[PDB]
C-alpha cells in the first residue's frame, strides 16, 4: 500500500474508492459544501443542506458512516487537557484504526481539514493505520492512499516531508510488527544498512566477536546467546563546521526472552517489539536526513537478541562495559540498559556528540509513571525537557517528564563488588523507570558537560497488536528546525 | 514377562504360581466349584461349600485374599452408570494394579469369568498391570502370565488377537514409561520402524532438515531445538481397491519442556508421557494389521522433542505449515497441535485418507472436560462420534464427546498478522481442549468432505506413575470389523 | 423501555425512530422492496435497485449502517456447525449489542425477516440488548421498541408469547445486573413473590431461623453470615390430575464473596451474578404460567448471600442437609451445590416432583467443559439430555452434555467422617463441573426413579458486563408443548 | 521529649548532654572554632587546629563520631541534582535517624550551621528523628532537645514558628506510628477536635448514620464495617473578606484491611499508616493557624476504618456519592479515593473553597511514578504545579508532578451501569496513581473554575518503621506567605 500526502483536494485514480473525511468539529462546522470538496463528497453526501444537517447533529467527536461500506466522517474533539496534545491526534487513530475497506477497494481518499499546527500529527495518525506487515495467505490487498490536506499555509515541500514522515512511521511499525524469526539481528542490521545507503551515510557495523574485542561488553554479553550475532550499527551524517553534534541511540533487542531470568508464559509474547527504540531512531534519522539536515547527526543502533543457553548472561555475572566501568548483572531481563550504556558512551567518546538521545522500549514500569500514550523522558537538561514535551504535543508522539536525581536514586544500583548493579530486584527509592535510565547515564557521568536525554517508550510504541511507529514524528518536530521543511522551521 | 491369553482354563508351568480369579458378582455366583476350576483353585479354596460361603459374604465388588501372599479373588461390579462402560473394566485395574507377587513367583495364573461382551476390556485391563519398563537394579522378575478366559463363545483366533492386544497395550505403556533420555526422537523412530518391518508396511521417514525442505513447518519448527532431530514416520498398509482409507495420526512429543514458554518446576515432571498418542496409534496399527485388516490403513507419527535453545520457537514467531497456511505461535507449549496440523494435512493431501483420526496427550484442560478416564473426542461426523463412544464402552478405553463448532470457537485463534494463532492465552469462547483441536482441523477445512476425529487422551493415558496403554483396545473395537477376528466382527 | 413483538410490519409512533433490519442472507436476498417494508425502509434506502445492489455487495454476515446514526442492517449467517444453533441467533446479539441510539431517539423499530423455526431465538437475542438496569445519573432514555416479525406462520397468540418471553429475558438480566447492595436476599424474595402474585401461585417462603428449624442445613448454613437472611421460596402452579410434576430449582446466591475461603481481588467482582440460575428459573416459570401451562409446575428458589463473619461456614464444618445426609464442607465457595441439594430434595420429597431441573451459575470449570455459549447439562435420563440439547438449538440458549457417571466420579467427594465432602480441592477423576452436580444429586439418589437434570450456566449467563437473560427461552422451548402457544406446540 | 528551636547557640540545662553538629561541608569549612561554638564543642573537639584538621579530612558528606557515645558531626553535601532539594535535608535524616543516645542522656544539643534557605528543611529533618510514639515497657527516656540555629537572618519569631513546625512534624508522625487498635476513628476525631479547640476553629463533626443521612456515601459506605464509626471532621478558620478560601482535605483511613478484596498477608502490615494524609493536613493547619494565617482555611478530615463484615462494601456495589454521582465499586481497597471524592465535593459546594488540596497515602503505584521521597501531585493548574514543586524543594517535603489528562485517562474508569467505577483492575491508559486521583476529581469537574491539587504521599510519608511527618513543612512553605512568619514571607 502506498501513501501520498498532497497539498489540497485532488482527484484520485480510477477504481473503487473509499472516502474518509477528517476534522475537528469547529473546523468541519465552517467547511462549505462546494468546489473540490463537493466534487469528492457528493457520492456519499446528498447536498449542502444534508451536510449541514449532519454536522449539526453529530456530537463533539466520533466516527459516522456516510455509506454502508465505503465512507466515513471522523470528528476530532476541539477541547484538550493540558497533559494531552491540543491536536487530539490520538482521537483520529482511535476512530480510524477499526475501519476496514471492502476487499475490492483500490483507493482510499482522505480529506483532512486541519489547521496548520495540527497537520503533522494528524497525517502521522492516519499513516499509522496502514499496517505494512501481514503474513496472511489470503485477503491481502494493496491500496493507493491519498491524504489530501486542506490547509492554507501548507507548501508543496511540506507535503513531500509529510509523505516521507508517513513512510518513516509505517516503516518503524513494520519493523516492530515483524516476528523475530524473520527480523533477526542480521535482518535488522540489513534494514539499517539500507537506510544508511539511501541517506549517503558513513556506515559502521561492528558485529559478533568484533564487539567483544572492541570492548562493547554490554552489547556483546547481552547478545552472545542469540541465534544470530549481536551488532552495533552507526549511520553518520557529518556536517563539517556544524554547531550541533546529535546522536540518536536506539535499543534494538530483536527479541527479549528475558534471558536466564526468563519471562513468564504470558510475559514473553509481544517481545519481538523490544527493538521499537532502534526502529524509531533509524526512521527518524531517515526522515531528517532526507530534508537537508544542517547539523551533524548519528543513528547508533544496539542490535541483539536476548536468549537462553549455557553461554548466556547469568545473574551474578560481572562484565566490563565500553566505558571501562564494571556492572554486576543481577537481572538478565534488564538488558536494554546494558546495551544502551555502551551506545551512549560510544556517542560521547568516539562520535563526540554533545546532544545524546537514547530511546528504548525499556521497562514495564514506564506505564505506571507516564501511562500508555506518553514516552517517559529523563534528562540532565531542564530546557531540553521542556522542549521535548513541546515537541510531543506538536507531533502527537507524547512525552512526559521523569525525575532526574542521580544523587537520590543511583544508590538503588549499589554493588559490593562491581561499580554498580544493572537493576534492583527489591524496594528502591527511585521510580524503577528512572533507575533503569540512570544505569545508562552512569557510564557518561549522567550527562555532565553535555545534554543527555533518555526516553522510555515501552507502552506508547504499541496499541493492541500493532506498533504505532512512535519516534519519527517526535524527532521531526524536535529537530526539524535544522531541516529545510517550512512547517518544521 | 510374557502374557498369553487362552480360551479356557488350562494347566500352567512348573514353578511357584500366583492365582488371581476375576469375575462380576453375578457371574461368580453361578460358577460351580468343580472340574478344571476346582483343580486350579483348591490349593487356596477348601471345597465348594467354602467357595459358596465366601461368594455369599463378599460385597458387590472388591478384592479378597485367598492366601497370605499367593492368591486373590477380584469381584467386579455388575451395575454401571450410563457414562461408564458396562464392562466395569476399570474396576479390575483398580483392584489388581496394587497387587504384588512374591519375589520367587514364576507363574501368574488368571481365571477370568467374563461374558463375551466383557472379555476384551477385561483382558486389556489385566494386561495393563504388567508394566514392562523398569530400571531398578535389584528385584527384577520375569513372570509367565496366563489369562484363561472362561467364555463359551470365545474362539482360538480370538485368543490370538487378545494376546496381540495385550502386547499392544503393554508396548504402548512401555514406550510411555521410558524416560526421554532413552526414548529420544531417534529411538521412537526406531520403534516405529520395527513395527513397520514386522507388519510388512511401506515405511516413509522424513527427518531433520528434510522436514524443513518438504514444508513440514509444524513438525520441523517444534522439534528443531531437540537434542535429536524431529521426524515424521508413515507406516502404510495399502489394500488395492479398499473402500476405506484410514489414517491414524499420533502426537509423538518424546519430551515436552514447554519450550521457551517453559513448564513450571511441578508441571514438567511426567512430560516423557507426551508421546502417548503416537505410541497408542502405532500399537493400534500393529494389532489391526496382524489380523487381516481389509482396508487401507496408515500410521502417521509426528515425533519431536520440544526443548529450549536460541534456535527454539519463541512466542510471536510466524511459521508456514505443511498446508501452506501461516500460524502465529503465541504458545510454544501448544506444540502438539502444530505437529498434528502437518500430520493430518499430509494424511488428507498425500495419503488420500478419507477417515482421519488424530490422537494426542494434548491439553491439561481435557481433564476439566471429560475427566481422567474418558478421552475427549471432537469430530465433524456425528455418526462417527456415536460409534467411537460405543467403541470406548466395548473396549474400556472410554471416550466422551467434545463440542464441534468451528463457527463459534475458531475466532478464539484469530491473528492480526497470520492466518491464525496456535492458542489463546486469555478468555476464550470455546472449551480450551476443543479450541486446541480446531487449530489442527483448520488446516484441513475442519474435515470438510471427509471424516475427521481428534481425540485428546492426556489424562486417560496414565494412572499414577504408569502409562495405561490407552488406544489399542479402542481402535481394535472401533475398526475391528475390518479384521478376521470373530469377537471384533 | 418497552418491548412489543408484533406479527407483521406495522407503523410505529410519532417521534424520532431508529430502524434496524435483521435477516439471514438467503432470506434478505428474497425480500422485495415494496409494500409495508418499502414504506418503513425508504427513509434510509433509496429504492429497490439500491436495496438489491447493497444485498449483492454485503458479505455472508455482519452489520451495515444505512444512515449516519439512525439505521442498520444486520445480516445473519445461513451456515452453522453441528455444535451451534442453526438459528445463528448469537450473531444477532454480537452485531446488535454494540449499537447505540442517538440521545433523542423515541422509537426503535426492528424489521425481523425470520423463518418460523428462527423467530423465537431471534426475538430473544434482540430483547437481550435492551438492558433495563442502569444507575447512571444522566443520559437515561426510555425507548418504545417494536419488533415486527415478517413470518407467514406466526399467529397473534405467538406475538403475545414472544412479548412475554422478551420481558422474561430482560427481567432475568435486570435481576442479574443489579448490584447486591440493592438486590439483597430480601429484595430477591420480594421479586419472586411479585411473580408469585401475578401468576396466582401458591407461595411458600421459609426464611432465616425457620430454615434451620425445618432442617434446610444447606440453605441455612450457607446464608447465615449474609447481611440479610437466607430464604427458600416456592411458587407452585398446581394442576389437579396432571401427568407431569415439574420443578425448576434455581441457585439464588445474591452475592458470593466465596465465604471464609474468600475469592481473590480479581475473582470477586461480578459475583452479584451468582443468582442468575434463580432469576432464569423464576422468569421461565413466569413465561410458561402466563400461557396456560397444563402440568403441575414449581419454581424453587434457594436465596442466600455467602459472606464472611465469625458465624460463617469454615472448611472442616460438617452440616446435616435437608435429606438427612451429612456433608463435610471443605470449600465454602462450593456453596451453590449445598443450597441446591436442599432445593432438589425438597422438590422430590415434599413437592413430589418427578421431573426436577436445577439451574445454577455453579462453577468456573463449566467454561472448560462447554465453553461460554453452552450451558452444561448433566442428567440421569438420556432422552431428556437429547431433548434439552434440541431445546437449546431451537431457543438459542445453547446446551451441551456433561458425562453422567456417579459410579466413576462420586468417589471424588469421599469423606472419612461425613457422608461426603462438598468438593475436592486436588486432583479428581471427574470433570469438576460434573462432580459439583453429583454433590447435588447425591441427596436424591442421583435421580433414581425420576428424571433429574442439572444445568450449569456460569458462563452463558453473561457476556461482557451484562446478563444475557439465559433460561426463559430454553425452558419455553423445552416445556412449551404444555402451553397454549402455537409456535411452542 | 521536648524540642525547642532557638536563634543562636545558647547554653543547655544541667545534665548529661549529647552534642550533634550539623552543616554543609562548605559552611563547616568556614566555621571558626571560637566564641559560643568553642564553648559548646571543646568537651569533644580539642582546639581549633584539631577542628580544622578534621574538617579537612572528612569527605563531601557523612557522619563522624566526636566521642565514644555522646557526640557526632553530620556533614551535609553541598551539591544536588535538579530533581532533589538543594537543601539536601534528606541527608540529615539519613545520618541522624540511626543515632542512639546513652540511656542516661538528659539533653540533646544540636548546633545547626545552615544558610537561611536551608533552615526550615534542616530543622524539620532533625525533628522527624525524635519519634514520640513507643509502647516499650522498659528503656523509655524523655530528652530535652535544643536545636540552635546559627544563621544571621533568623528572627525570634522564626524560631517560634520552627518550634511549632517541629511539633507539627512530630505530631503527624506520632499519629501515623500509633497502632489502629489505639488510634481508632473515634480517637482520630478526638485528636482533630483537640487541634480544633486549640486553634479556636469552628468545628463540624458528622459521624456514623449522620453521614448516610447527609449523603456522604463515600465516607459512610467505606467506613460502615469499621469497629468504630466513620466521621467527617471540618476545622474552619474563617477570615471575613479574605481573597483566598483554601481547603486541606486529608485521607484518614485509620486502618486499611483492603475490605472484602482483602490485602495479602505481607500487604496488610503497615496499614495503620493509611491515615497519614489526614494527620499531615491536620498538623499543617495547626502550624499555619498558630501564625496569623490571613486567609480563610479549612481542614477536612475523612476518617474511616476499612474492615471486613457482611455489611462491608463488596465489588459490584453501586453507591451515590455526596456529589450525587454514582460510583460502581470494583475495588474495596481503592477506598481513599471514594472518601476524598466526598471531602473535595464538600469543600467546593459547602465551604465555597476556591483552592482545594487533597493529600493521601493513596496508592502503591505512586512509588513507581515519583519514587519514595517525592509526593506525586496532580493538578488542573500549571502555575500551582510549579509552585508546589518549588515549595517541596524549599521545605524538604519533595513533590513531583503527575500528568493531568482527564480526557485521555478518565475512560479507564468507565462503567456500564454507574457514572464511573472507582478503579480499573486490568490494563489502563493512565498512570494508576493519576487515575486514582481522577476518580476524586470527577466529582468536582476535575477542578473546573477553581484550583484543585491532589497529592499522593503513600511512600514519602514513611521511612523504615516510622512516619516521616510529611505535610506540615510542605504546606508551611507553600502557604506561609499568608502568615506573619518572616522566613515564610
Ligand atoms: Na479472500
Ligand atoms: Na532383591
Ligand atoms: Na445527557
Ligand atoms: Na532499661
Ligand atoms: Zn529485558
Ligand atoms: Zn528488553
Ligand atoms: Zn506442550
Ligand atoms: Zn505436548
Ligand atoms: Zn461460591
Ligand atoms: Zn456461587
Ligand atoms: Zn485501600
Ligand atoms: Zn487506603
Curated annotation (Swiss-Prot), chains A, B, C, D:
User: Pfam families annotated for this entry?
Assistant: Pdase_M17_N2 (PF18295), Peptidase_M17 (PF00883)
Under the cellular component aspect of Gene Ontology, which terms does the record hold? cytoplasm
UniProt family annotation = Belongs to the peptidase M17 family.
- In the UniProt record, what gene is named as encoding this protein? lap-1
Q: Which key words are in the record? A: Aminopeptidase, Hydrolase, Metal-binding, Protease, Zinc
Documented EC number(s): 3.4.11.1
Under the heading InterPro entries, the entry gives: Leucine_aapep/pepB, NPEPL1_N, Peptidase_M17_C
Task: Extract one GO molecular function annotation from the record.
Answer: metalloaminopeptidase activity
- Asked if the Swiss-Prot or TrEMBL record annotates the protein with the keyword Acetylation, the reply is no
What Gene3D superfamilies does the database record attribute to this sequence? Zn peptidases, Zn-dependent exopeptidases
Give expression by tissue: Expressed in the buccal cavity, pharynx, anterior gut and rectum.
Q: Which reaction does it catalyse?
A: Release of an N-terminal amino acid, Xaa-|-Yaa-, in which Xaa is preferably Leu, but may be other amino acids including Pro although not Arg or Lys, and Yaa may be Pro. Amino acid amides and methyl esters are also readily hydrolyzed, but rates on arylamides are exceedingly low
Function in brief: Probably acts as a digestive enzyme.
Residue positions binding Zn(2+) 1: 256, 333, 335
Q: What class of enzyme is it?
A: hydrolase
Organism field: Caenorhabditis elegans
The entry's Zn(2+) 2-binding residues are 251, 256, 274, 335
One Gene Ontology term from the biological process aspect of the record: proteolysis
Q: How is the cofactor bound?
A: Binds 2 Zn(2+) ions per subunit.
Active-site feature positions: 263, 337
Q: Which cofactor does it need?
A: Zn(2+)
Provide the protein name. Answer: Leucine aminopeptidase 1
